[PDB]
Structure formats: C-alpha cells, structure tokens
C-alpha cells in the first residue's frame with residue numbers, strides 16, 4: 001500500500017499551531033483527570049497506539065488512516081483506557097473539523113510531550129482518513145509480560161533498532177499503569193506529567209522486587225511505590241539494551257534528541273511525503289508564546 005501525504009486544503013503552519021494551542025490550553029484546563037496527572041500521558045499513549053499498528057512488510061496499520069475512530073480498533077483490548085484521549089480530542093476536532101483524524105491523534109502526542117517540558121518533536125501534516133475496511137485487526141500492539149528477545153523482535157516490525165526501542169520506552173516516565181485497564185498497577189516514577197529521563201534513572205537506581213499484582217500478573221516493584229513491566233525490566237537484563245539505558249540515564253540532552261527522532265519516525269511510518277510537501281513544523285509551546 002502507498003499512502004501519500006496530502007496537506008489539508010490551504011492549511012499552513014499557522015493553522016496547525018492553532019490546533020496545537022487548543023490542545024495545549026485544554027491540557028492546562030482539564031487538570032483533574034486521573035488523580036491530577038492530567039491528559040498528557042494518555043495523549044502520548046494514544047499517538048503511540050494509533051501509530052504502532054504499522055507493519056513495514058505491507059504498510060498496513062500506521063498513523064495515516066486515523067482508523068482508531070472505528071469500532072474494531074477502539075475496542076482493541078490493547079487500547080483499553082485510550083477512549084479518555086479520544087474524548088479529550090473530541091472538542092478539538094469539533095472546533096477544527098478540517099484536520100484529519102491521523103493528524104489529530106499524532107499532533108495530540110506531540111503537543112502533550114512538548115507541553116510536559118519534553119523535547120521539540122517536528123511534526124508533518126497530511127495524513128488522510130481511510131475507510132473502515134482499512135482498520136488493522138487487533139493484536140498488533142506489544143505484550144507486556146515478555147522478555148528482551150520479544151521486545152527486539154516486536155519492534156523490528158516498526159523498523160526500530162535497539163537505540164530507537166530504548167529511547168521510545170522512556171515515554172514510561174509519563175502516567176501510570178491502571179489495574180482495570182491493563183492488569184498492571186502503578187507509576188514508573190514520581191513526576192508523572194513531566195517529560196524527563198526518570199525512567200532510566202529509576203530502572204538503574206531503584207531496588208526492584210519481582211511481585212504479583214492483584215490481577216495475578218508479575219511486575220517489578222520498588223519501595224518508592226514505582227513499578228516496571230517485565231518488558232521495561234528486560235532493558236536492563238539484555239546487555240545491549242543495558243548500555244543504552246545507562247547512556248540515557250546519564251545524558252538528558254541525548255535522550256531528548258533521540259526520543260524526538262524516534263517518536264517522529266514512529267508517527268510518520270508508512271507515509272510517503274511528496275518532494276514538494278512542506279517541511280516539518282516545530283510548534284511553539286504555550287509558554288514560548290506567553291499564552
């Protein structure tokens with residue numbers, strides 16, 4: 001399948017900065033959600049899950065089609081809880097009905113990362129809604145109960161290498177696991193709505209114990225009240241992953257730069273950009289705009 005980016009008619013940087021701003025202002029306003037974590041983490045996860053269905057072999061799934069809007073995909077057991085991100089974006093889509101669903105889901109993630117003090121993530125427009133029959137089947141998102149070999153192999157389908165995998169997983173600085181959603185419970189760290197390299201520092205510095213949670217699933221727990229999924233913990237069990245974890249734990253700027261590249265790549269997988277497509281946009285934060 002070939003998916004060619006097509007700019008929403010007549011729209012330019014200024015139009016998308018307005019959409020960014022509306023998302024960012026609502027992120028500020030709706031501050032009570034999930035015990036005052038806010039919608040930042042769930043928006044990042046939404047961007048990731050809507051992109052992470054991609055299969056490099058046949059170009060099925062991916063961010064282009066905005067297919068999460070269809071029942072098969074929004075009811076994916078892997079997507080439990082993402083309805084909160086979708087509901088958040090509903091009034092944004094109402095105000096800006098011209099933006100494609102794929103553009104909105106991916107921009108939601110970019111906006112959340114930046115507003116939570118993360119790196120700038122260049123973002124390109126032009127994803128185009130595709131019909132219901134293009135919705136990828138359930139089961140393309142990764143299991144949490146597996147090891148490093150599983151993680152490495154899984155991410156090859158998304159054309160991600162070891163460095164890209166470890167960088168992307170640092171998004172687990174954000175939010176938490178929710179028992180009723182995924183069968184895991186707890187945050188990965190303390191500053192749940194600030195984008196930092198805390199995931200790597202916690203992996204290396206906390207004293208982890210392999211325990212069973214109330215859903216009868218194993219997770220690694222620390223006395224600080226943090227947790228790690230088996231797949232997170234695998235990043236320090238595998239010697240190749242471990243080196244990269246140590247790298248990011250010791251260099252905030254390097255982690256920011258690598259995450260930005262990997263996250264843009266994730267959000268752009270499957271999309272053909274014409275030679276005369278606009279350059280990627282780098283949106284100003286509300287803080288940068290004095291808003």
Ligand code: HEM
Pocket residue numbers: 041042044045048081142143144145151168169171172174175176177178179181182183184229231263
């Ligand atoms: C091996 C790969 C991964 C696995 C197995 C995994 C698994 C999970 C699970 C089980 C949850 C908890 C869901 C819940 O109960 O609310 C979660 C949350 C989350 N994931 Fe991951 N994930 C992976 C990779 C990623 C990537 C690549 C990103 C983005 C770059 C990401 C971003 C997030 C965020 C921000 C949350 C918190 C959501 C919230 O607080 O509502 N994850 N993940």
Ligand SMILES: N=NC(=O)c1ccncc1
Pocket residue numbers: 077078079141142143144145181182
């Ligand atoms: N990315 N994978 C997930 O979010 C997930 C993993 C395991 N169980 C539910 C959801």
